[PDB]
Amino acid sequence: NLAPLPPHVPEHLVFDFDMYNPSNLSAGVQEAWAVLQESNVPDLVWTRCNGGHWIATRGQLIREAYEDYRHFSSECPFIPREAGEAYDFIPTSMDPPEQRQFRALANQVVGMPVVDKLENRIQELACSLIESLRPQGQCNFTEDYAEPFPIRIFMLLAGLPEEDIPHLKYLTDQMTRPDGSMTFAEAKEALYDYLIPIIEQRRQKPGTDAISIVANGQVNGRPITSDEAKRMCGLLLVGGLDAVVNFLSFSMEFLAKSPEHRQELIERPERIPAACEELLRRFSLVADGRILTSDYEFHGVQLKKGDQILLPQMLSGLDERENAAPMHVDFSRQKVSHTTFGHGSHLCLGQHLARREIIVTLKEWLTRIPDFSIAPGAQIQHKSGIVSGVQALPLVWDPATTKAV
Numbered sequence: 001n002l003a004p005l006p007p008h009v010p011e012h013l014v015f016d017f018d019m020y021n022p023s024n025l026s027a028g029v030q031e032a033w034a035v036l037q038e039s040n041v042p043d044l045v046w047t048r049c050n051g052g053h054w055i056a057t058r059g060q061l062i063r064e065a066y067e068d069y070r071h072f073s074s075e076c077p078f079i080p081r082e083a084g085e086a087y088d089f090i091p092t093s094m095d096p097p098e099q100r101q102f103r104a105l106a107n108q109v110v111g112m113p114v115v116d117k118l119e120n121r122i123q124e125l126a127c128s129l130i131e132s133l134r135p136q137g138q139c140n141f142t143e144d145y146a147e148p149f150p151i152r153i154f155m156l157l158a159g160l161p162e163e164d165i166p167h168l169k170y171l172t173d174q175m176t177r178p179d180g181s182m183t184f185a186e187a188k189e190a191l192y193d194y195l196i197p198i199i200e201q202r203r204q205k206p207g208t209d210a211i212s213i214v215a216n217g218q219v220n221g222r223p224i225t226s227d228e229a230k231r232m233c234g235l236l237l238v239g240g241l242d243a244v245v246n247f248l249s250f251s252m253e254f255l256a257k258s259p260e261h262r263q264e265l266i267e268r269p270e271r272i273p274a275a276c277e278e279l280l281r282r283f284s285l286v287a288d289g290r291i292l293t294s295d296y297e298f299h300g301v302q303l304k305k306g307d308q309i310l311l312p313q314m315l316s317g318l319d320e321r322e323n324a325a326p327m328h329v330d331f332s333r334q335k336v337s338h339t340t341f342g343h344g345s346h347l348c349l350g351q352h353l354a355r356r357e358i359i360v361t362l363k364e365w366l367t368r369i370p371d372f373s374i375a376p377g378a379q380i381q382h383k384s385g386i387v388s389g390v391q392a393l394p395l396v397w398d399p400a401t402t403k404a405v
């Protein structure tokens with residue numbers, strides 16, 4: 001329902017957008033969020049949905065707010081407020097200067113040096129999964145590739161058993177796109193409960209996996225505590241099991257419906273990295289925010305201490321003020337502007353792993369299954385939330401048109 005409009009929020013700035021169930025969802029989730037960028041919509045609006053909160057609708061404000069951590073704090077980064085208040089993941093719930101010592105440790109476990117090391121394994125897994133699907137002439141992309149490819153790689157990095165994925169994925173799903181079975185707080189508590197004994201076990205018998213590295217790590221010279229390790233490992237799990245998975249599906253859904261773009265990458269594979277970036281812009285999918293630390297006038301609007309403001313990372317790149325004909329996918333786009341991996345001090349630490357996974361997928365899939373389409377009649381459904389996603393993606397193809405490598 002709609003929360004009563006607070007006395008300080010101008011009546012004319014009200015736009016009741018529901019980030020968990022946008023009205024234009026059937027047209028595609030990015031299209032649904034883009035309604036916030038239609039002709040008569042202000043740069044900053046207030047929605048009475050989900051408890052009531054501000055929403056910056058243009059890249060200019062989104063970037064500015066993410067850069068000003070003194071006014072826009074990460075302490076309560078999720079909407080609804082109850083979720084944001086329970087949210088204590090490290091380093092994401094912290095603002096600089098406190099954030100830095102923890103972010104450095106996190107970067108060491110998922111950063112570029114680590115992705116370089118996972119290269120061959122990422123490559124091998126992508127190829128094995130695709131080769132097994134190839135002769136079948138069909139697949140449920142979300143469950144047969146989007147999920148197993150990146151998640152198995154992350155579980156390998158974290159040294160966690162793959163049989164634990166169903167439980168962990170159910171929990172992360174409730175934190176980003178809740179179905180109602182669990183509140184954010186309940187899902188977080190369950191994720192922490194899962195981690196507690198594992199962290200204790202690896203602090204006693206350290207391994208070479210990500211959890212061991214975090215649990216036995218140091219933060220600017222001093223030993224990390226068990227609680228801190230838990231709050232950081234929980235965040236790494238959420239980061240590695242959701243966004244990339246859903247992004248792969250948005251991208252493949254698009255390629256399945258646009259033979260022309262597939263052909264472009266088939267004929268010119270060297271354009272894959274650039275295509276990856278353009279797809280990251282067009283099918284951006286994350287949207288979290290910040291909380292006002294004090295009363296502050298921002299772009300002519302009076303924000304009050306405690307107000308929550310959603311700063312959709314997804315919207316910057318779809319903003320026509322940042323990219324002409326934003327809804328059009330142009331792998332040759334000159335200046336691909338976006339904040340898909342965030343902006344400011346909290347820039348995504350797993351973006352290098354994500355780009356590698358996306359590029360590897362595009363290359364290895366198009367090489368074996370150049371021609372494919374969405375199952376006839378299928379009405380693809382998207383879901384909206386902190387991280388938007390694709391419910392299911394049934395694909396089909398003629399095995400005769402494929403080739404083994």
Ligand code: HEM
Pocket residue numbers: 074077090091092093103106110235236237239240243244247285286288289313339340341342343345346347348349350351353354
């Ligand atoms: C296409 C995939 C991905 C997208 C679009 C994405 C997007 C984002 C965004 C928007 C943020 C900033 C959130 C904020 O400012 O509140 C973020 C932070 C982060 N992401 Fe990603 N991410 C992706 C994949 C990954 C992967 C694979 C990992 C690996 C575990 C990961 C780990 C992290 C971490 C640890 C942070 C927190 C950094 C900090 O708070 O300083 N991400 N991501």
Ligand SMILES: CC1(C)[C@@H]2CC[C@@]1(C)C(=O)C2
Pocket residue numbers: 089092176235238239243286287288386387
């Ligand atoms: C918004 C995010 C993508 C980012 C990494 C996982 C996530 C859901 C967070 O809680 C911080």
Ligand SMILES: [K+]
Pocket residue numbers: 005006007008009010011
């Ligand atoms: K008012």
Ligand SMILES: [K+]
Pocket residue numbers: 075076077084085086087088093
């Ligand atoms: K909090």
